[PDB]
Amino acid sequence: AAPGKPTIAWGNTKFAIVEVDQAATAYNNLVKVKNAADVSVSWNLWNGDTGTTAKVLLNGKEAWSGPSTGSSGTANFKVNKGGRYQMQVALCNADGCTASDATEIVVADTDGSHLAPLKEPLLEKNKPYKQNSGKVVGSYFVEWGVYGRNFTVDKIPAQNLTHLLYGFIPICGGNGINDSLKEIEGSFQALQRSCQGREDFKVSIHDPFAALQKAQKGVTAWDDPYKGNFGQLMALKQAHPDLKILPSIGGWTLSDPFFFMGDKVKRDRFVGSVKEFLQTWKFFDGVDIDWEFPGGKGANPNLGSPQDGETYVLLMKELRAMLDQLSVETGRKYELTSAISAGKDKIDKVAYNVAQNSMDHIFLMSYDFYGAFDLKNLGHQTALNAPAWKPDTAYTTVNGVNALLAQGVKPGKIVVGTAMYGRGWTGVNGYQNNIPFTGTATGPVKGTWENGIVDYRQIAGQFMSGEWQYTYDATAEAPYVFKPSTGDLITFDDARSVQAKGKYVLDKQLGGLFSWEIDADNGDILNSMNASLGNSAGVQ
């Protein structure tokens, strides 16, 4: 007679291809990529003949087989594809095979193939749009926003984006290499712990807790291998397979290492680390370079060289070649983007007409034109155009687009920037014709998280009532709120100035719109990005 029906033993059923060490703080120890997950299964036979061969099947297909030598047994084998499998133990002899009931086993991988889709309700004022204009609709999510800001990946209105970018992936390096980080208390140190034992100029993760271990909606079980922002992003990719999720390297405080990359030894080490990062974290779809900025004038006054332009073009070409190679290895399309200054002084230190051939999108940072870093020369921080009182205004959105176009950049490359935050001043005084921007200021406006800077959500929530004046400047295409009695002045984007940027994008055949940053919107900004580029209301 065929053997008795085996009973799968109680035991761990959750396994991982990319293992995460739960007691590590250095990136090199935290992650271990294997070629296959080590799976184990045990069984008992409570009644009957134990058979002469035992097999483990996944979805009916043999993953292991061995001699059946008594009433219990254990099998250890490898599974090289992530997903959920119906695992059975069968005992066979010449008279037949008898299979256990099925037990599901979970084989995790960083494409999120083991996770349920994270498909959450839109929150606050976000309304559903279809991505059917063919234009870019992008926004950045910030790794550090998950604590006091409390803005986690399940709150991203992800159906309303084509592109979701992650700020920021740091480049390893201590003194002389990441000195701009020393301004943020604990931040430089944090990076050194993350990068212990790791070569400088290789990428890492700045806050491993927030990125991979903090419990978050859908990734709260103790033995869920990937939690934090990265586990949620994986599940978001299951819900939105065509969302592009890109890691952004650099930003204001983590751009110093790019200034050493005219040394091709360092540049190659960087690019190889990016390759390895994307092989490790397969939910990411490419890389976004936010080097602030070729030529200097970013956070560090000691950095910037005339050579930076050439290094930026080389960096992009080599990044492209590495992604082209990763792309054919995997069958996937990978994107290479960059966030760049929109000031013409900085644009022209790079030959974007050459670098564009390696890039899918150029995220023009058409904001921060004015702000509490200058208390004497006030203006609109993110306006489309110059205002009527100063038609020669250098830093406007149109001027940054025009500088790119004059180099020979194709319009379709250029993605226009919208701010989901205002910048502002306090104590504004000495201005003419009731235009507060002609005045000067005594210091920064009180910010939401940091001085001089205010989330759009709080502009709309707190500063559009009471004594606050609201004006929309129709020449510049820019809103501003002014509190006459303290002289608080705040310059922002709103639904209408965004609509002006979107129409402009459509009129000039540009590539679309992107925003910084997604936690600061209440829905009005991304709603207008979508509507102004001609995306249809509703869901597909």
Ligand X SMILES: CC(=O)N[C@H]1[C@H](O[C@H]2[C@@H](O)[C@@H](NC(C)=O)[C@H](O[C@H]3[C@H](O)[C@H]4N=C(N(C)C)O[C@H]4[C@@H]3CO)O[C@@H]2CO)O[C@H](CO)[C@@H](O)[C@H]1O
For the chain, first and last CA: distance in Å?
Answer: 55
Give the single-character DSSP code of 121.
P
402 exposure class (CB count in 10 Å sphere: 0-12, 13-18, 19+)? middle
Tell me which amino acid residue 326 is.
L
- Among 226, 421, 437, 504, the residue binding ligand X under the rule CB under 6 A is 421
> What b/e string do you get for 329-347 counting C-beta neighbours within 10 Å, with b at 16 or more?
eeeeebbbbbbbbbbbebb
Binding mask 471-510 for ligand X (x = CB under 6 A): ----------------------------------------
CB of 197 to ligand X, least distance (A): 22
Binding mask 22-61 for ligand X (x = CB under 6 A): ----------------------------------------
| 140 lies in the site for ligand X, by CB under 6 A | yes
| 517 lies in the site for ligand X, by CB under 6 A | yes
Minimal CA–CA distance to 325: which of 337, 315, 312, 334?
A: 334
Minimal CA–CA distance to 32: which of 104, 147, 131, 110?
A: 110
Backbone angles phi, psi at 146, to 5 degrees: -95, -5
CA distance 427 to 438: 13
Is 292 annotated in the active site? yes
Identify which of residues 251 and 424 has a Cβ nearer to ligand X in the complex.
Answer: 251
Binding mask 273-312 for ligand X (x = CB under 6 A): -----------------x----------------------
Identify which of residues 140 and 226 has a Cβ nearer to ligand X in the complex.
Answer: 140
How far is CA 201 from each of CA 148, 204, 210, 256, 257, rounded to the nearest angstrom? Answer: 30, 9, 22, 10, 7
- Among 126, 248, 356, 382, the residue binding ligand X under the rule CB under 6 A is 248
- Among 110, 139, 253, 399, the residue binding ligand X under the rule CB under 6 A is 253
CA distance 243 to 335: 12
Minimal CA–CA distance to 403: which of 303, 411, 179?
A: 411
| 397 lies in the site for ligand X, by CB under 6 A | no
CB of 414 to ligand X, least distance (A): 14
Cβ-based neighbours of 211, under 8 Å, separated by 6 or more? 143, 205, 228, 229, 230
| 365 lies in the site for ligand X, by CB under 6 A | yes
CA distance 180 to 188: 8
Minimal CA–CA distance to 114: which of 105, 126, 122, 123?
A: 105
| 468 lies in the site for ligand X, by CB under 6 A | no
How many beta carbons lie within 10 A of that of residue 449, not counting itself? 15
Q: For residue 81, how far is the Cα from the chain centroid?
A: 25
CB of 432 to ligand X, least distance (A): 29
Interhelix angle for 264-280 vs 308-330, to 10°? 30
Cβ-based neighbours of 537, under 8 Å, separated by 6 or more? 127, 128, 129, 130, 531
Our CA angle for 455, 460, 461, nearest 5°, is 90
CB of 520 to ligand X, least distance (A): 7
- Among 259, 281, 352, 363, the residue binding ligand X under the rule CB under 6 A is 363
Q: For residue 506, how far is the Cα from the chain centroid?
A: 26
CB of 131 to ligand X, least distance (A): 20
CB of 363 to ligand X, least distance (A): 6
CB of 453 to ligand X, least distance (A): 5
- Among 450, 485, 507, 539, the residue binding ligand X under the rule CB under 6 A is 450
| 171 lies in the site for ligand X, by CB under 6 A | no
| 188 lies in the site for ligand X, by CB under 6 A | no
CB of 62 to ligand X, least distance (A): 49
- Among 111, 285, 360, 368, the residue binding ligand X under the rule CB under 6 A is 368
CB of 170 to ligand X, least distance (A): 8
- Among 15, 85, 141, 144, the residue binding ligand X under the rule CB under 6 A is 144
How far is CA 320 from each of CA 308, 365, 408, rounded to the nearest angstrom? Answer: 18, 22, 20
From the candidates 143, 292, 477, 517, which is the catalytic residue?
292
Q: How many residues bind ligand X (CB under 6 A)?
A: 22
Q: For residue 470, how far is the Cα from the chain centroid?
A: 33
CB of 138 to ligand X, least distance (A): 9
| The one segment of 34-42, 70-78, 122-130, 251-259 that binds ligand X by CB under 6 A | 251-259
CA distance 24 to 455: 35
Give the single-character DSSP code of 519.
G
- Among 339, 342, 378, 498, the residue binding ligand X under the rule CB under 6 A is 339
- Please say whether the beta carbons of 385 and 476 come within 8 A: yes
Identify which of residues 41 and 172 has a Cβ nearer to ligand X in the complex.
Answer: 172
Q: Which residue is nearest to ligand X (CB)?
A: 251
- Among 184, 221, 406, 474, the residue binding ligand X under the rule CB under 6 A is 184
Beta strands in 380-494 (DSSP E): 414-419, 421-426, 443-444, 453-455, 469-473, 478-483, 488-491
Tell me which amino acid residue 209 is.
F
- Among 73, 218, 231, 251, the residue binding ligand X under the rule CB under 6 A is 251
| The one segment of 116-124, 248-256, 261-269, 461-469 that binds ligand X by CB under 6 A | 248-256
- Among 453, 459, 460, 500, the residue binding ligand X under the rule CB under 6 A is 453
Q: Which residues bind ligand X (CB under 6 A)?
A: 140, 144, 167-168, 184, 187, 248, 251-254, 290, 339, 363, 365, 368, 421, 449-450, 453, 516-517
Catalytic residue positions? 292
